[PDB]
């Protein structure tokens, strides 16, 4: 896995150069916003099982077929599998919120997710809309808790739904 620091370290290592002015400025930029990420992560660790359920109910209010007959969140086995999947998305979104880099999401979530979902019949679309219902919930909850900047909260879910995304453009 990579955080932002090991990203800069691997970036400078492949050319064999030391840190310049700009590398120290980007490391200061990660270390200055570190406390903000950590109180956001602790506030998510407060209400994880609540946020996952609320994002799930907002997703099922969005796409109503999945609770109904032909949908994929049909039975309670499928309902519990979908809510555990949303718990996975919030967990690795917290991990990428603390790390500040998208390599944990790429190595442990997004690599080969589409294969499993296309095979099992799990749809990819309401998965993404549920991921960003989680993102919107986290964003307004942490903007309510005195935190000025929300770009780092914006980062990992936007990456996760740029990757599961179907490129049609």
């Amino acid at each position: 896995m990579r955080d932002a620091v090991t990203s800069l370290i691997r970036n400078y290592d492949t050319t064999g150069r030391y840190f310049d002015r700009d590398a120290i400025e980007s490391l200061k930029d990660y270390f200055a916003s570190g406390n903000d990420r950590i109180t956001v992560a602790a506030m998510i660790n407060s209400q994880s099982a609540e946020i996952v359920k609320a994002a799930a109910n907002s997703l099922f209010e969005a796409v109503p077929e999945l609770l109904l007959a032909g949908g994929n969140a049909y039975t309670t086995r499928r309902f519990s599998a979908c809510l555990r999947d949303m718990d996975y998305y919030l967990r690795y979104g917290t991990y990428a919120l603390i790390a500040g880099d998208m390599d944990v999401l790429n190595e442990r979530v997004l690599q080969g997710l589409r294969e499993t979902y296309n095979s099992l019949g799990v749809p990819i679309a309401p998965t993404v809309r549920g991921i960003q219902f989680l993102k919107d919930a986290i964003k307004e909850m942490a903007a309510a808790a005195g935190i000025a900047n929300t770009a780092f909260i914006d980062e990992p879910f936007d990456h996760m739904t740029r990757e599961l995304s179907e490129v049609d453009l």
Partner: protein, 160 residues
């Protein structure tokens, strides 16, 4: 780094980050300023560190520069100082990252196999990092010398 190690250690355990690990990440996040100061101290004076450490090494272990040793000749001594420069760069990376996974994960895993394939005595390389540690901790304040000497200590420990 610290964040990578905490994330992976919570990741195998199928749990979130425990609050103790979270204040560990928080304390590392606060101490990053002193880490960057130690990194600028190590980066800006690399010429004198490599020069004085090579001088004290070849004073201490003269057989590797004598005919018959590995670092005998102009280009071989230049490659020897280049290897010392590599290890000082990895020391700076480990100082910034707050953990030795840059140093170990770049330049310490197959170091015995590589230096055995080159024909190099690894104890003399440990003496080179020892002289680098002496010059570097002679260059800083007390707690800064202790925090840099932790990573220098890890490199000499991972040699032997």
């Amino acid at each position: 780094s610290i964040v990578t190690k905490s994330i992976v250690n919570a990741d195998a355990e199928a749990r979130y980050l425990s609050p103790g690990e979270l204040d560990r990440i928080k304390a590392f996040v606060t101490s990053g300023e002193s880490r960057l100061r130690i990194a600028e101290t190590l980066t800006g004076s690399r010429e004198r560190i490599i020069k004085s450490a090579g001088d004290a090494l070849f004073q201490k272990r003269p057989d590797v520069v004598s005919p018959g040793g590995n670092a005998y000749g102009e280009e071989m001594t230049a490659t020897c100082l280049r290897d010392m420069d590599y290890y000082l760069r990895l020391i700076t990376y480990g100082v910034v990252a707050g953990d030795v996974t840059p140093i170990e994960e770049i330049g310490l895993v197959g170091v015995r196999e590589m230096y055995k394939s080159l024909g190099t005595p690894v104890d003399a390389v440990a003496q080179a990092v020892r002289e680098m540690k002496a010059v570097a901790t002679g260059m800083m304040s007390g707690d800064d010398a202790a925090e840099a000497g932790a990573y220098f200590d890890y490199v000499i420990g991972a040699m032997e």
